[PDB]
Amino acid sequence: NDKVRFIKDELRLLQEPGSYVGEVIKIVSDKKVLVKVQPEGKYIVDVAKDI
């Protein structure tokens, strides 16, 4: 039961889509931050529920 469950849970992470990676340049006044996405351009984007 532990083993079969894990092999399926890692598969579930693959199927659901990618991620990227930025660095916060500054904080803006709508509760969003100015990120520079390192391999592309900038995007201004909302905080998490843990952040």
Partner: protein, 53 residues
């Protein structure tokens, strides 16, 4: 070392208060871009967007 050390404790309270203000303030983040006569603009603006050009 009495003449400065007694009263120094009192200043440390003052430094602590200077720490407390910046975070207290930073907790509150709101916009609006533009002014009140340009709040009318958006009611129109919704429409001009749904149209393609």
């Amino acid at each position: 070392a009495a003449p400065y050390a007694a009263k120094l404790k009192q200043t440390e309270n003052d430094l602590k208060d200077i720490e407390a203000r910046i975070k207290e303030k930073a907790g509150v983040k709101e916009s609006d871009t533009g002014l009140a006569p340009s709040h009318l603009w958006d009611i129109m603006g919704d429409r001009q967007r749904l149209g393609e050009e």
